[PDB]
Amino acid sequence: INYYKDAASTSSAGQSLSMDPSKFTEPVKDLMLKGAPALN
Amino acid sequence: INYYKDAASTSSAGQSLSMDPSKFTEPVKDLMLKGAPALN
Amino acid sequence: TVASISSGPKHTQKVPILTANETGATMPVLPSDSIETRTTYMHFNGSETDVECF
Amino acid sequence: TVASISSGPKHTQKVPILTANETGATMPVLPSDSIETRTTYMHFNGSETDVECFLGRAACVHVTEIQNKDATGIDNHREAKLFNDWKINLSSLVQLRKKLELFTYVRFDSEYTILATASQPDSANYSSNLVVQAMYVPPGAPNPKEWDDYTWQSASNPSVFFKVGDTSRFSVPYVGLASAYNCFYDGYSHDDAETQYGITVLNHMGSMAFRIVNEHDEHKTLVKIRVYHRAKHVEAWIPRAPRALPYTSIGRTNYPKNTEPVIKKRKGDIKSY
Amino acid sequence: CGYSDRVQQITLGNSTITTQEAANAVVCYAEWPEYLPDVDASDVNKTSKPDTSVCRFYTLDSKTWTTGSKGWCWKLPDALKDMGVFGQNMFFHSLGRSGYTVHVQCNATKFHSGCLLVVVIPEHQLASHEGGNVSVKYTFTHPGERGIDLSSANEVGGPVKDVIYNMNGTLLGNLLIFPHQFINLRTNNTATIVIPYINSVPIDSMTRHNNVSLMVIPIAPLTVPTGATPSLPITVTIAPMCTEFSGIRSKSIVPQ
Amino acid sequence: CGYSDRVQQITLGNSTITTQEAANAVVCYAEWPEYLPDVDASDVNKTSKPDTSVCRFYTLDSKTWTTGSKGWCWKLPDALKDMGVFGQNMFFHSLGRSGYTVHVQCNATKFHSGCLLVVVIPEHQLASHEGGNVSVKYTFTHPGERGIDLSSANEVGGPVKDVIYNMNGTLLGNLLIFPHQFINLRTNNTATIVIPYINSVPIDSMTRHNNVSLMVIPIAPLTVPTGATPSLPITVTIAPMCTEFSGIRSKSIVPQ
Amino acid sequence: GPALSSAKLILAYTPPGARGPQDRREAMLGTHVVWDIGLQSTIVMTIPWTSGVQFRYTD
């Protein structure tokens, strides 16, 4: 329960469970599957 | 009612009514009944 | 959440350990790709690694 | 719950009073097995005998003394008590250490209370309105070197600000790497002929560095910070024998030479009452 | 329907022990040893199970029980780290996991008197003889099949051998809280204690960390009949069970 | 659908080998190794399976391939009887059973020329150098990881090293009947041969009896380019598989 | 290196408890991955989690 009206008072959001490390680990145009030759 | 989100804040659990002193008093392989000869 | 999957001996043409970092991609190679691993669970959520807590 | 059942004269071949302790079992022989008992009830639950209450009451577990003064010209500050640090150990006070050692493994989230009191034995017209900064130091966190070090920012190190006399109250989830604290560790941290025995990763939880952040007044205020601890979410395993000899160190069961007897000698022979 | 509770037979691998005056075997904390389930594993390498090769009764050198013997103490798996392939599986890895089925043997006639205390003390961290803040040196707490004789002289780095204080500051009368059994020469001659893996972690080192410690402490002094030899042999036999190892490694290097 | 037949990966236990110019692996007689079924067992003791501890790639000391090298010969499981816990499981029993996944390694550039003959000869009983009715002494045929260098001088009790006669009286050109593979520096640099257990019995001794023998015989002489080192390293890596042992015994006593 | 070069390397991971490998025969006993340098210029050896305790200290 909040005691104030404006959003500056609300508490933190906790944790963002929506993870997606692909944008940083595999920022490649063509799809690369584990095991298959990276270049062919 | 809790005022905090993380489990470090909750109160104690009270009492664990689930008791089982057999593991400490009778940690024997074969079952021993009161009255019957312990060894035969 | 599963941490490491069960994997036995591997004799195949698919080599997940060989890649080319010239592409700039980090293949998510797991321990089950290089050795024989057992079934294990994470038992961890990562609440303290979020940017909101860090 | 029934305490004692009704039992009259017993003339049978089943002898519940005779057994063989060579088996290692403790037969739950009741008073109704040796005498004639009446129907009685327990009227008792045992809420205060639980490990959560036996080990889960706030108590003092460490203490130190420091000062807040004009620190000019004191090259070695920390060793001069311009700020003092204590390695977290539940084995420095004996009346709680014994209760904790009664078992081999204990898992608990902790509760800490840091008690500081202002005082001036020397000439001092008043007792300042201090604001004590209490800081948690995880393994690796820069063990501060001066009262004004680059650590007190506390960006990752937990900090709690509060005035002297009043106490902080922060909870700590179980910070062990195992499923419990190794109350007894019959093992070494690694294989070396010069390593320390028992005291290992399981023992070191970090340390608590005490100070004051207010700039100095005109006199030395020798502060004694007493630390109190309550155990929360207590779980115990592998009960052990009660502590008989006292301690000399933390985490070590080592005792002194020529220790004093613990058994109360009788006055007379074995037949005296 | 006629049987006996003192006649027991334990067959593990290719070893078989027989007894006719044994006491009800003690299962420490009513928990039989079991393989580490996947829901608790933290390491990633797969475990190897030398089920039949190492899970067998290994007989340790017998001890001489005299009228002045204080007791004996053994550490596990240290007591079996020089025994065949178990020692190699223990050294060549960084960690190990296995249960133990201890079997103490002490036979005598109906004229002898005495009582031995066979107790398993998990995490038996012993006390040093110098006090203050002295440590106990790895070279002593890990003897091997030799064990620790509580009647010998103390050496620099070996813990104190005051059997009264259990070598750790606890009284002898309080060791009964641990899983134990008495070998009463009039009633019992062989004790059996099935020891599971007891530790705060799913897996831990087996060379630097000994999970349990076996102790044989004579409570009642040995009173042999008139004209008999004032000595009785005590043979300790331990059999690993549910053994596991992870991370076959360059041999673990111990001193000597 | 795009892949390659020269890029292969073999993962056994905690060891992993990678190659990009390998030839189609040879499965000796199209029979993969399999555990001894009950319908053929003659011994009564139960077998122990150190699946993960011993079934891993053990890299043997590399050899130097010169313009005058005749070849090299290795005996199994002799070649791995001093390797970690496999050697102990091999000695401390009277018999053993296990397959082998041989992997020879010899890399070079596109300018070098030469061809190695990697062949597995089951029951390679070698010939003595003295003729008549002389025997070959156990001390030589069982070198260990050392192997037999066919270019060295003969010693009393070691078989003859005439690579032409395959050390047994058979011509080199006829060894191709056995499961083999050529390491052609222009086409292949790593050979792989999965060797199953080959013997007339369900189980036999593993210390006194070597089931198979690995040979690396250079057929075409090494012709290095002008100005290059006239030597190429040959690394042999063997991985046991489907290992079994029966009758844990007092250590097998070999000479030395 | 040059594309016309050939070389075989063995990356060996030694779990805790044993000293650092001083030779190749001692290194190859533990977790190792034989790297064949060819068209694939990069090798990816995942160091497996081999520990008794659930977590190790960063320091």
Q: Record the resolution, in angstroms.
A: 2.8
What are the φ and ψ backbone dihedral angles of E85, each rounded to 5 degrees? -75, -20
Q: Report the relative pairing of strands F15-19 and G31-36 from DSSP bridges.
A: parallel
CB of B9 within 8 Å of a chain D CB? The answer is yes
Whose structure tokens read 């009264």?
Answer: E164
Chain E, nearest residue to F13 by Cα: E46
CB of E27 within 8 Å of a chain B CB? The answer is yes
- Each domain of chain E, given as residue ranges in start order, spans 8-248
Q: How was this structure determined?
A: cryo-EM
Burial class of residue A11 in the structure, from the number of CB atoms within 10 Å of its CB (0-12 exposed, 13-18 middle, 19+ buried): exposed
CB contacts of F18 in chain G (<8 Å) are 33-36, 40, 43
Task: Say if CB C17 and CB C35 are below 8 A apart.
Answer: no
**D142: three-class secondary structure by DSSP:** coil
Q: Report the relative pairing of strands D40-41 and D132-137 from DSSP bridges.
A: unpaired
Task: Say if CB D198 and CB E209 are below 8 A apart.
Answer: no
Q: What order of strands is seen across the sheet that includes strand G31-36?
A: C10-12, F8-12, F15-19, G31-36, G8-13
Whose structure tokens read 């009191």?
Answer: D117
Whole-number Cα distances in Å, D141 to C51, D83, E175, G3: 20, 16, 41, 46
Q: How many CB atoms lie within 10 A of CB F11?
A: 26
CB of F7 within 8 Å of a chain A CB? The answer is yes
Which of these, F239, F11, F247, F236, lies nearest to F104 by C-alpha position? F236
Burial class of residue D254 in the structure, from the number of CB atoms within 10 Å of its CB (0-12 exposed, 13-18 middle, 19+ buried): buried
Distance from C-alpha of D10 to C-alpha of F180, rounded to nearest angstrom: 87
Distance of CA E115 to the CA centre of its chain: 18
Distance from C-alpha of F215 to C-alpha of F217, rounded to nearest angstrom: 6
- Number of helices (H), then strands (E), belonging to chain E: the values are 3, 13
Distance from C-alpha of G3 to C-alpha of G41, rounded to nearest angstrom: 9
Whole-number Cα distances in Å, D205 to D89, D133, F20: 8, 19, 49
- Each domain of chain B, given as residue ranges in start order, spans 1-40
Q: Report the relative pairing of strands F212-223 and F58-59 from DSSP bridges.
A: unpaired
- State both tokens at E221: 């002094």
- Number of helices (H), then strands (E), belonging to chain B: the values are 1, 0
Burial class of residue D169 in the structure, from the number of CB atoms within 10 Å of its CB (0-12 exposed, 13-18 middle, 19+ buried): middle
Whole-number Cα distances in Å, D31 to A32, B21, D20, D229, E67: 77, 18, 19, 41, 39
Which of these, G3, G48, G16, lies nearest to G37 by C-alpha position? G3
- State both tokens at F182: 């050529």
Distance from C-alpha of D182 to C-alpha of D167, rounded to nearest angstrom: 29
Q: At what angle do helices E84-91 and F84-91 cross, to 10 degrees?
A: 180
Contact between chains at C21 and G45 (C-beta distance less than 8 A): no
- State both tokens at E250: 């360059």
Which of these, E208, E193, E238, lies nearest to E79 by C-alpha position? E238
Chain E, nearest residue to C40 by Cα: E38
Chain G, nearest residue to F20 by Cα: G38
Which of these, E161, E117, E119, E112, lies nearest to E140 by C-alpha position? E161
Going by beta carbons, is chain F in contact with chain D, meaning 3 or more pairs sit under 8 Å apart? no
Which of these, F35, A17, E176, lies nearest to D21 by C-alpha position? E176
> Ramachandran region of residue E64, left (φ > 0), alpha (ψ -120 to 50) or beta?
beta
Distance from C-alpha of F183 to C-alpha of F216, rounded to nearest angstrom: 10
Please give, rounded to a whole number of angstroms, the shortest distance from the CA of D151 to a CA of chain E: 32
CB contacts of D201 in chain G (<8 Å) are 53, 57
Distance from C-alpha of E76 to C-alpha of E214, rounded to nearest angstrom: 8
Rg (CA), chain A: 20
Residue type, F102: V
- State both tokens at A23: 């944008």
Which of these, F63, F90, F33, lies nearest to F147 by C-alpha position? F63
CB contacts of G42 in chain A (<8 Å) are 38
The answer to whether the peptide bond before residue B37 is cis (omega within 30 degrees of 0) is no
Residue of G10, G14, G40, G42 best to disrupt the C interface, most CBs of C under 10 A: G42
Task: Say if CB D137 and CB D208 are below 8 A apart.
Answer: yes
Please give, rounded to a whole number of angstroms, the shortest distance from the CA of C12 to a CA of chain F: 6
Residue of F12, F14, F106, F185 best to disrupt the G interface, most CBs of G under 10 A: F14
- State both tokens at F92: 């401390």
Residue of G51, G54, G55, G56 best to disrupt the E interface, most CBs of E under 10 A: G51
Which of these, D27, D29, D33, D40, lies nearest to D8 by C-alpha position? D33
CB of F43 within 8 Å of a chain E CB? The answer is no
Residue of A11, A15, A20, A40 best to disrupt the C interface, most CBs of C under 10 A: A15
**F115: three-class secondary structure by DSSP:** strand
Outline where chain E has alpha helix (H). 51-54, 84-91, 138-141
Chain A, nearest residue to F9 by Cα: A35
Which of these, F253, G25, F53, D187, lies nearest to E89 by C-alpha position? F53
Contact between chains at G56 and D139 (C-beta distance less than 8 A): no
Distance from C-alpha of E188 to C-alpha of B17, rounded to nearest angstrom: 38
Which of these, F234, F227, F222, lies nearest to F67 by C-alpha position? F222
Whole-number Cα distances in Å, E240 to D84, E63, E180, F98: 49, 21, 18, 25
Dihedral sign (CA D215, D217, D218, D221) = negative
Distance from C-alpha of F192 to C-alpha of F182, rounded to nearest angstrom: 10
Distance from C-alpha of E47 to C-alpha of E206, rounded to nearest angstrom: 14
Distance from C-alpha of D3 to C-alpha of G50, rounded to nearest angstrom: 52
Residue type, D193: A
What is the DSSP-derived secondary structure letter of residue F184?
Answer: E
CB contacts of E50 in chain F (<8 Å) are 48, 50, 53
Residue of D177, D179, D185, D189 best to disrupt the G interface, most CBs of G under 10 A: D177
CB contacts of A36 in chain C (<8 Å) are 14
Whole-number Cα distances in Å, D264 to D134, D261, E173, F151: 45, 8, 14, 85
Question: Which residues make Cβ contacts (< 8 Å) with residue B8, sequence separation at least 6?
Answer: D109, D171, D172, D173
Distance from C-alpha of D223 to C-alpha of D221, rounded to nearest angstrom: 6
Task: Say if CB D89 and CB D203 are below 8 A apart.
Answer: yes
Question: Residues B1-40, buried b or exposed e (16+ Cβ, 10 A)?
Answer: eeeeeeebeeebeebeeeeeeeeeebbbbeebeebeebbe
Distance from C-alpha of C34 to C-alpha of G13, rounded to nearest angstrom: 11
Q: Hey, what CATH topology would domain F8-248 get?
A: Jelly Rolls (2.60.120)
Distance from C-alpha of D230 to C-alpha of D57, rounded to nearest angstrom: 5
CB contacts of F15 in chain C (<8 Å) are 35
For E61, how many CA atoms within 13 A lie in the half-sphere containing its CB? Answer: 14
Contact between chains at G41 and C33 (C-beta distance less than 8 A): no
Please give, rounded to a whole number of angstroms, the shortest distance from the CA of F135 to a CA of chain G: 33
Query: Hey, what's the torsion of the CAs at C32, C35, C41, C43, to 10 degrees?
Result: -110
Going by beta carbons, is chain F in contact with chain C, meaning 3 or more pairs sit under 8 Å apart? yes
Task: Say if CB F152 and CB F72 are below 8 A apart.
Answer: no
Dihedral sign (CA D246, D252, D253, D255) = negative
- Which residues is D86 bridged to in the sheet? D208
Distance from C-alpha of B15 to C-alpha of B17, rounded to nearest angstrom: 6
CB of E247 within 8 Å of a chain F CB? The answer is yes
Burial class of residue D138 in the structure, from the number of CB atoms within 10 Å of its CB (0-12 exposed, 13-18 middle, 19+ buried): middle
Distance from C-alpha of E14 to C-alpha of D180, rounded to nearest angstrom: 38
For D255, how many CA atoms within 13 A lie in the half-sphere containing its CB? Answer: 22
Outline where chain F has alpha helix (H). 51-54, 84-91, 138-141
Distance from C-alpha of F63 to C-alpha of F81, rounded to nearest angstrom: 19
Burial class of residue E195 in the structure, from the number of CB atoms within 10 Å of its CB (0-12 exposed, 13-18 middle, 19+ buried): buried
Going by beta carbons, is chain A in contact with chain C, meaning 3 or more pairs sit under 8 Å apart? yes
Distance of CA E102 to the CA centre of its chain: 6
Burial class of residue E119 in the structure, from the number of CB atoms within 10 Å of its CB (0-12 exposed, 13-18 middle, 19+ buried): buried
Task: Say if CB F216 and CB F62 are below 8 A apart.
Answer: no
Task: Say if CB A36 and CB C21 are below 8 A apart.
Answer: no
Distance from C-alpha of E194 to C-alpha of B29, rounded to nearest angstrom: 9
Rg (CA), chain B: 20
Distance from C-alpha of F55 to C-alpha of F74, rounded to nearest angstrom: 18
Task: Say if CB F69 and CB F232 are below 8 A apart.
Answer: no
Distance from C-alpha of E122 to C-alpha of D105, rounded to nearest angstrom: 10
Distance from C-alpha of F132 to C-alpha of F158, rounded to nearest angstrom: 15
Distance from C-alpha of E173 to C-alpha of E117, rounded to nearest angstrom: 10
Distance from C-alpha of E254 to C-alpha of E245, rounded to nearest angstrom: 18
